[PDB]
Write a protein that binds this ligand. Structure first.
Ligand code: MG
Ligand code: ZN
Ligand code: ZN
Lengths: 1342, 50, 99, 90
DNA sequence: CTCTGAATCTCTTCCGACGCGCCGCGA
RNA sequence: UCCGCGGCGCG
DNA sequence: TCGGAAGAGATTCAGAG
């Protein structure tokens, strides 16, 4: 229509709004009841808003279009269409101004901070409680002075008419119109440069920028106080009839009527010369009425109606989940849709869904009209309608003709991830249930216990082409969350295949030879041999040769009849070995995956369908079933339980003799019950799992049992070892609601009856779990909404940015366990640098190569330990990411195509598993390797051991090929029994430490001499009359005297002559201070060896909250402090609770001082040389400081590691890319440290793209570029921080962002996805992307 | 008359329902026998003792 | 339940909700994100503008479908005009640019 | 019927570009009424266009040159018509 | 002994899934 | 032809 | 006609003068 390019917002000038309005409304009347006609000058006055009916004059003067576009003489109504009623806005004119409640009440008082006034004063003047002052030079009274009534009278009775004092509305209007902007701008900036206080500086800066925003928008600030108030058109605030002739009035109409009434009252009291207090009361009521109209409930008590409910003001029509933004602009209701209960249909091919005939007829009724007239069977739409409503079977023939290639979309609420909507080619069935193919039903997360599903039909041919090419289920084989296929069988299919491939030691026809799988099928179907019988069969297989031909091979192999039968369906090219074992769920999954990699898409689809058919058929023929005799109870159980209860009695009587504390008695009982439960479980599994049967020759032999429940568990079709354990073994301990474990475990299994007590205590867990999931759903949905909002802008916009930067990928290893191999972390990513063959300079993998499966296998063969890959966070693309930095698209297998929206994919991929999350002294070598130290400094002693002065060293055990095997952190001062590079074996002790104390280490031998210490002041003389030998303890600051304050207890080391030995490498003396409350085992004046120690020192949350805190950039409550500077630590002044630490740079001239608290244990002893980003004290880690110290790569590695850790603990797989993209989206805001020659002001928040572009052009013309630091804002703030104010207003805090944009004079270019979705043009992603490129070229041409 | 999937039973742990099924097969069993014992129209004393 | 076409609401001009009113299903925001995950722009545009809210575009679409031509002409969602009128009535001036 | 389009996508490479090309081809086949280049087998214009691009007979540049030559034919008809009108006036 | 800045405390505001189905009531 | 509010109900 | 987290404002404590 109007083809707008952007949207602009600003304050409303009163002349502008008056120009909008086609008239003023002056009376509260709404509609006549005698005749349903609007009153003149009323809220629905037709003379203003136009006629109620098309070209119908209120007076009845004119009735038809012959006079279209003329005004009736008897009345001012116009001969036009009713649509104008929707458009035209009225206006009302007030006898007094009124503050617009938004600018007052918004969290920063924009008017208040503009005028520097406290909000209490502003409300006390605007609400008519006090006067305020405007000054004249003859009076000492200054302007903006608050003035109470007694002060008002006191001032006026001496200086009346010399100064002036007014109430809130008029005074604020006059003040705003009586101030200049440039003078206050310059005074504010001069104060900013002259002042120092950071609070004062930030207030000054925000005022400066507010004034700059007002001047650059040119919006006269006084406009913030309304003087003329718009009237919403009648249709948007409809008055709707009711039964009995009543009418529901929209609350907006009542608020408007109240405001009109108050305005009329105030004008009448003014024009008849009322006394002062009366008109003041009336105008205060009018101001309150306007506040109610705009934002009822925003201040004080909310207005309410007869229903005792608060009325919904205008602001409530846009705020909240019922608001206009969320309810209608997004999430429209749609035509051509249906819903129905779903149902299994196994006879369907993969790509076709069974759609009830009635729904098809209803949906395609327009298409049927069309084709029926086209084929000449019906002449007019009435004929078509009457024919289709009579269902003349020719309509059924036409209906079968129309849909033959017409895909439809199936959707299941909630649409957790994009698989939730899929496309199918319909097939017509009588009945009323929609029939799905079970395989895709598994992907839907759907079930068949009564889940409904909704169906939409695309209209246009471009739309149906999109549905076919993109959405058809034959395309969505690979999940976006990971590369593994999503179309995977379960339940009966897996059970059937498992039964079909399981062999037994002796069966009908064992040992015969079959010339081909067809004969195997014959012998099975003719009943002369059972599936399980082992036999030799001649089989042909094929392989993809070096050229790409399917070269054949034929041979005899040992197999089972069932296995040959299954092989017969396998397509050419897969090796026979894939089948020749007991096929579980995982085996079938990897079989489908290997089919998809070796062959194309369509052979895999056909293979899937054939698998489904054969599995179902043979499962049915199997007749597997569950019976009460199957859940065998191991007869050992009674004995084990008697033993356990005997031990319980023993420990209980041991406590009865008082030999132990009750807590340890509880612990012992719990331990023995757990041990007994495990023993019973093992006995049950052993008895169930295997059984003895006679062989062919007549002897007993063991084999895997065909017990039904065991077969179901072992196949992986359904159930688990836990459920089997509960079914037959004793189910064990259970927790009280506090999470503590009841001493008496539930002893009876499910097969025997549970007593009432066991059942009752068990119900605790059941209701705990149900409440748990009920609550978790909401948090998961909320989190997903957030992630989507933050990442929705990001789209692949170019092929290659040309960045050599990237991140280093190594396998994730914790505590000697390889939690994640390198192949998974690097598959599908592009090499940032050329990979070299280990130990050589030869290039193994070139730079900028997408690492597919063959490259990963090659990397594994050469045992490459680390790779460097391109990352989303390191991409140089502006307003997007390049295809090479993102890498392989999980859903397709190759490099991602241009124009794909990746952020939304990542957001859904993170959100969906969230439904599954839960929410309420020595080192031993594990295996062979070599010991290496990551970062260490070590000293060796007379005992032959090694003691370490690095506080964050890690042992790493390395493979003979240089790959890592194990790694473990080692505390300060631990003792080590081995040198670096020595060989190690499993179970070998290599290092030791006391975890219950902190030592202090002396590197060189010598004679200790106490220094800077006095007994009873810095140290006190412990003689442990109750414990043992003499000792000395440093007196804490509360215990030490003032003489012990500046004297810091220490010991120097001296030579044999008593001369103070120097540190071996520095000019500092070998001086070792004793921290507060430190303990030393040695007295003054004793010898100590090199590498020897003397010091004694006194020394979890749920997954979903943890991930929420990570992505919200939450500051941890005990932030570890790290060295902001490279230098030497140094002590200094002391004060209450906090120590004045200082770091002194080695070469730098700028020391820094920090208020390090003393209650946290310090890891610094006045000798620790330290570098930037090194830990000074431990604790939870603050992401912002990590970013400041160690850069973007450190923080991205930290975030990805934590999120992957929690998810892998749950067992869900999510590729790192979807976390890295979120991290890059978090990282937009930067701050300017110097402007160079740029126009940017210092300390401003700027989007990283803008400053990057500005610096690039600035250096492109040779000027000094600006410098910046990047700030990790939380995802909520980062989503609100965007320039696209429309998206922000859609998301949260609508009033705040609207006010901010309004005062700013913001403009949004409508470049993201959400904005275009609101507007309704094509999104700039996917197929729409191309449409935009031409447009932008035209916009470049324009 | 009705065919149910067995796979649900171990994973939902509705073992009791299987027992119900067994009792059903027992219950109608007696019914069937007594039905036949009625259909042959034999002496009521025999069915009384049964 | 199924709805090809029927009644339309007064204020928002969107189709009615619920079986009793013979309304259509709701293409909730989660489904919109699902479409955004695909490259399927055209079906999204059709879902929002023509099928739902364009007071004239859906008439044109009905005409063309009856005629057997699967054209499309996206106008402007009337709910957007409703939002504009409410924001203006609030006293905040908002307007389109580059007409 | 068409089980999958993946071969056509391989030919065009960009999946979305395939959708656009097939869309315009089907548009001109339906309203313009130009006949399919391959047998139709009671299929629909959509799958017809998909097969045609699958055979490599139809591609963005091929559409471009076809549109160019059709425009040249139309303008030749216009010029010959106006020359005939002038000959009628003379 | 006093003044200013920084830190801490108090008060106020925002958020706390998507989807359908029936019933009642409506100054 | 309709704005809801409350309530149960199933996903 | 209900608890939790974040931000802003106010009050108190420590350090420096
Ligand atoms: Mg279900
Ligand atoms: Zn008139
Ligand atoms: Zn890049």
């Amino acid at each position: 229509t109007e083809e707008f390019d952007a949207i602009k917002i600003a304050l409303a000038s009163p002349d502008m709004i008056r120009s909008w309005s086609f008239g003023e409304v002056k009376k509260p009347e709404t509609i006549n009841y005698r005749t349903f006609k609007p009153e003149r000058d009323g809220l629905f006055c037709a003379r203003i808003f136009g006629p109620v009916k098309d070209y119908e004059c209120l007076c009845g003067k004119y009735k038809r279009l012959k006079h279209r576009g003329v005004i009736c003489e008897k009345c001012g109504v116009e001969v036009t269409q009713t649509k104008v009623r929707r458009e035209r806005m009225g206006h009302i004119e007030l006898a007094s101004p009124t503050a617009h409640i938004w600018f007052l009440k918004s969290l920063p008082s924009r008017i208040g901070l503009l005028l520097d006034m406290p909000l209490r004063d502003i409300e006390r003047v605007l609400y008519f409680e006090s006067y305020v002052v405007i000054e004249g030079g003859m009076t000492n009274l200054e302007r903006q002075q608050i003035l109470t009534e007694e002060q008002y009278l006191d001032a006026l009775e001496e200086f009346g008419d010399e100064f002036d004092a007014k109430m809130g509305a008029e005074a604020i209007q006059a003040l705003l119109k009586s101030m200049d902007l440039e003078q206050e701008c310059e005074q504010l900036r001069e104060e900013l440069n002259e002042t120092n206080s950071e609070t004062k500086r930030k207030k000054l800066t925000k005022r400066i920028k507010l004034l700059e925003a007002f001047v650059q928008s040119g919006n006269k600030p006084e406009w913030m106080i309304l003087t003329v108030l718009p009237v919403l058109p009648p249709d948007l605030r409809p008055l709707v009839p009711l039964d009995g002739g009543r009418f529901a009035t929209s609350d907006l109409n009542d608020l408007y009527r109240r405001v009109i009434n108050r305005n009329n009252r105030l004008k009448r009291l003014l024009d008849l010369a009322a006394p002062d207090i009366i008109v003041r009361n009336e105008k205060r009521m009018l101001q309150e009425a306007v506040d109610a109209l705009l934002d009822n409930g925003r201040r004080g008590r909310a207005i309410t109606g007869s229903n005792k409910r608060p009325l919904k003001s205008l602001a409530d029509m846009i705020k909240g989940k019922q608001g206009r933004f969320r309810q209608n602009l997004l999430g429209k209701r749609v035509d051509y849709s249906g819903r129905s209960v779903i149902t299994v249909g196994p006879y369907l091919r993969l790509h076709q869904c069974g759609l009830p005939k009635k729904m098809a007829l209803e949906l395609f009724k327009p298409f049927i009209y069309g084709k029926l007239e086209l084929r000449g069977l019906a002449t007019t739409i009435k004929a078509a309608k009457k024919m289709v409503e009579r269902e003349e079977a020719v309509v059924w023939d036409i209906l079968d003709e129309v849909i033959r290639e017409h895909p439809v979309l199936l959707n299941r609420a909630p649409t957790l991830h994009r698989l939730g909507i899929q496309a199918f080619e319909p097939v017509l069935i009588e009945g009323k249930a929609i029939q799905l193919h079970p395989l895709v039903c598994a992907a839907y997360n759907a079930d068949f216990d009564g889940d409904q599903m909704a169906v939409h039909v695309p209209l246009t041919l471009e739309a149906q082409l999109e549905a076919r090419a993109l959405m058809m289920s034959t395309n969505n084989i690979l999940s976006p969350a990971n590369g593994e296929p999503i179309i995977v069988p379960s339940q009966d299919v897996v059970l059937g295949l498992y039964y079909m491939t399981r062999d037994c030691v002796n069966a009908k026809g064992e040992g015969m030879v079959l010339t081909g799988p067809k004969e195997a099928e014959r012998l099975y179907r003719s009943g002369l041999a059972s599936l399980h019988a082992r036999v030799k069969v001649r089989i042909t297989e094929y392989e993809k040769d070096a050229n790409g031909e399917l070269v054949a091979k034929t041979s005899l192999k040992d197999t089972t009849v069932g296995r040959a039968i299954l092989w017969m369906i396998v397509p050419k090219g897969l090796p026979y070995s894939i089948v020749n074992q007991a096929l579980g769920k995982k085996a079938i999954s990897k079989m489908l995956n290997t089919c998809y990699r070796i062959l194309g898409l369509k052979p895999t689809v056909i293979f899937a369908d054939q698998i489904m058919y054969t599995g179902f058929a043979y499962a049915a023929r199997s007749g597997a079933s569950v019976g009460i005799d199957d859940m065998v109870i191991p007869e050992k159980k009674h004995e084990i339980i008697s033993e356990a209860e005997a031990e319980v009695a023993e420990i209980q009587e041991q406590f009865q003799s008082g030999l132990v504390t009750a807590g340890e008695r509880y612990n012992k009982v719990i331990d023995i019950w757990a041990a007994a439960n495990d023993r019973v479980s093992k006995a049950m599994m052993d008895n169930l799992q295997t059984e003895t049967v006679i062989n062919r020759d007549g002897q007993e032999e063991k084999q895997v049992s065909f017990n039904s429940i065991y077969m179901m568990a072992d196949s992986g079709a359904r159930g688990s070892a836990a459920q089997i354990r509960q079914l037959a073994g004793m189910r064990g301990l259970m927790a009280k609601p506090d999470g503590s474990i009841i001493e008496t475990p539930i002893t009876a299994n499910f097969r025997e009856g549970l007593n009432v007590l066991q059942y009752f205590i068990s119900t605790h867990g059941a209701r705990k779990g149900l409440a748990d999931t009920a609550l978790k759903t909401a948090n998961s949905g909320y989190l997903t909404r957030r992630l989507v909002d933050v990442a929705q802008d990001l789209v692949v916009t170019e092929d290659d940015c040309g960045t050599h930067e990237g991140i280093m990928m190594t396998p994730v290893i914790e505590g000697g366990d390889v939690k994640e191999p390198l192949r998974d972390r690097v598959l599908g990513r592009v090499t940032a640098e050329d990979v070299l063959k280990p130990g050589t300079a030869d290039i193994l993998v070139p730079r900028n190569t997408l690492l597919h499966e063959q490259w990963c296998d090659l990397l594994e063969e050469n045992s490459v330990d680390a790779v460097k890959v391109r990352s989303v966070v390191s991409c140089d693309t502006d307003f997007g990411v390049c295809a090479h930095c993102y890498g392989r698209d999980l859903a397709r297998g190759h490099i991602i195509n241009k124009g794909e929206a990746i952020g939304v994919i990542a957001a859904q991929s993170i959100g969906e598993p969230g439904t599954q999350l839960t929410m309420r002294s020595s080192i031993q070598v594990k295996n062979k390797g070599s010991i290496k130290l990551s970062n260490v400094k070590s000293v060796v002693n007379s005992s032959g051991k090694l003691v370490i002065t690095s506080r964050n060293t890690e042992l790493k055990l390395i493979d003979e090929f240089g790959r890592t095997k194990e790694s473990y952190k080692v505390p300060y001062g631990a003792v080590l029994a081995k040198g670096d590079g020595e060989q190690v074996a499993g179970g070998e002790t290599v290092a030791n430490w006391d975890p219950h104390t902190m030592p202090v280490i002396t590197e060189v031998s010598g004679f200790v001499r106490f220094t800077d210490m006095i007994d009873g002041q810095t140290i006190t003389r412990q003689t442990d009359e109750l414990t043992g030998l003499s000792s000395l303890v440093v007196l804490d600051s509360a215990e030490r005297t003032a003489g012990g304050k500046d004297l810091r207890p220490a010991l120097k080391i001296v030579d044999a002559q008593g001369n103070d030995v120097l540190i071996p490498g520095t000019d500092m003396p070998a001086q070792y201070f004793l921290p507060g409350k430190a303990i030393v085992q040695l007295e003054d004046g004793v010898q100590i060896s090199s590498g020897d120690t003397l010091a004694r020192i006194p020394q979890i949350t749920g997954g979903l909250p943890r991930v929420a805190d990570l992505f919200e950039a939450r500051r941890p409550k005990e932030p570890a402090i790290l060295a902001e500077i490279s230098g030497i630590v140094s002590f200094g002044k002391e004060t209450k609770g906090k120590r004045r630490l200082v770091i002194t740079p080695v070469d730098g001239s700028d020391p820094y001082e920090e208020m390090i608290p003393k209650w946290r244990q310090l890891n610094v002893f006045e000798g620790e040389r330290v570098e930037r980003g090194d830990v000074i004290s431990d604790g939870p880690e603050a992401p912002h400081d990590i970013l400041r110290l160690r850069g973007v790569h450190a923080v991205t590695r930290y975030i990805v590691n934590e999120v992957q850790d929690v998810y892998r603990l749950q067992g869900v797989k999510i590729n790192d890319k979807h976390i890295e993209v979120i991290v890059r989206q978090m990282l937009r805001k930067a701050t300017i440290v110097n402007a160079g020659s740029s126009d940017f002001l210092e300390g401003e928040q700027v989007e990283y793209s803008r400053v990057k572009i500005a610096n690039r052009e600035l250096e492109a013309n040779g000027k000094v570029g600006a410098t910046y630091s990047r700030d990790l804002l939380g995802i909520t703030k980062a989503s609100l921080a965007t320039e696209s104010f429309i998206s922000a207003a859609s998301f949260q805090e609508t009033t705040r962002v609207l006010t901010e944009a309004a005062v700013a004079g913001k403009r949004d270019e409508l470049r993201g996805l959400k904005e275009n979705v609101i507007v309704g043009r094509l999104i700039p992603a996917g197929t729409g992307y191309a449409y935009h490129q031409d447009r932008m070229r035209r916009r470049a041409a324009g | 008359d009705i065919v149910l999937n067995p796979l649900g039973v171990p994973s939902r742990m509705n073992i009791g329902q299987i027992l119900e099924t067994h009792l059903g097969m027992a219950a109608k069993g007696i019914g069937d026998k007594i039905n036949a014992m009625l259909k042959q129209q034999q002496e009521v004393a025999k069915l009384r003792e049964f | 339940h199924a709805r090809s076409t029927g009644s339309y609401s007064l204020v928002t001009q969107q189709p009615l909700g619920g079986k009793a009113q013979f309304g259509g299903q709701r293409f909730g925001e989660m489904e919109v994100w699902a479409l955004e995950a695909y490259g399927a722009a055209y079906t999204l545009q059709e879902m929002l503008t023509v099928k739902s809210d364009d007071v004239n575009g859906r008439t044109k679409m009905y005409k063309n479908i009856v005629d057997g031509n699967h054209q499309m002409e996206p106008g402007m969602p009337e709910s957007f005009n409703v939002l504009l009128k409410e924001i203006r009535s609030l006293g905040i001036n908002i307007e389109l640019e580059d007409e | 019927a068409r089980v999958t389009v993946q071969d056509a996508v391989e030919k065009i490479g960009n999946r979305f570009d395939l959708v656009l090309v097939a869309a315009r081809r089907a548009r001109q086949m339906q309203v313009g009424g130009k006949d399919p280049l391959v047998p139709e087998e009671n299929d629909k214009t959509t799958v017809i266009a998909l097969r045609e691009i699958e055979e490599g007979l139809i591609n963005n540049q091929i559409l471009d040159v076809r549109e160019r030559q059709e425009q040249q034919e139309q303008e030749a008809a216009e010029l010959q018509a106006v020359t005939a009108i002038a000959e009628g006036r003379r």
